[PDB]
């Protein structure tokens, strides 16, 4: 995957957080952990995580 | 005859008759919902219908974005 191929798929913030390089994704050996889950779309998973996080953070820190 | 009459419903995946429960399980269509699983025996047929619907809508989007 080239850099312009990556930036056509992901958002601008997700691309800018990783590339601070040499125009290539270079993951190391001890960097990633593989966790299995149910196949769901990314926006639905982020919506459920946002919902549980806002229901957790309501009594402890409202601001 | 009664045994084969029950086995006819068994062999077509209509065992675990919860279709009336399954259609009331599809009332929640709120924002982000899954299949809300009922049956298991007919799931091959539902999956083949899902894949053909995905191919149909890919071709329909390719026609709409072109004509």
Swiss-Prot record, chain B:
Homododecamer. This is Portal protein. It comes from Helicobacter pylori bacteriophage KHP30. It comes from the Viruses. Forms the portal vertex of the capsid. This portal plays critical roles in head assembly, genome packaging, neck/tail attachment, and genome ejection. The portal protein multimerizes as a single ring-shaped homododecamer arranged around a central channel. It is found in: Virion.
